[PDB]
């Protein structure tokens, strides 16, 4: 039960900023399905003062990925990404956005 709260579907860049950009806790992220690559996803996250982008890759396997580890799915990819950086520089953990019912 419950549809997962980080699918936005084909929200803008610029979109996915401005709202995580309100979001009070850092790692506040969403999945939305990119605009200048038509058929990939795009990971957004809240840290600080800034919303960074990351690429959601995927292998000729059709397995998804953000750096070395693949996924079988963005469903895994994600979770991974709760407890393990989504970022190599900086230790940013993905939590759900707070959402009012
Ligand atoms: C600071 C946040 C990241 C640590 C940083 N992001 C980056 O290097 C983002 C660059 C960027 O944002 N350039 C403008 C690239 C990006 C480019 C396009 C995107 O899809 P759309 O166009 O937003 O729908 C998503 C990310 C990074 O090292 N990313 C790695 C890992 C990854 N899979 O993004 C990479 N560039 O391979």
């Known amino acids: 039960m419950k549809p997962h709260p980080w699918f936005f579907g084909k929200i803008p860049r610029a979109k996915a900023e401005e709202m995580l950009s309100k979001q009070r806790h850092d790692g506040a992220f969403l999945i939305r399905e990119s605009e200048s690559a038509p058929g990939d996803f795009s ?3 809240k840290f600080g003062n800034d919303v960074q ?49």
Not at 68 to 90: A, G, I, P
């Open 53 to 101: 982008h990351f690429k959601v890759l995927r292998d000729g396997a059709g397995k998804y990925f953000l750096w070395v580890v693949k996924f079988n799915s963005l469903n895994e990819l994600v979770d991974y990404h709760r407890s393990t950086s989504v970022s190599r520089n900086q230790q940013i953990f993905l939590r759900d956005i707070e959402q009012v019912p």
């Open 43 to 45: 990971l957004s996250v």
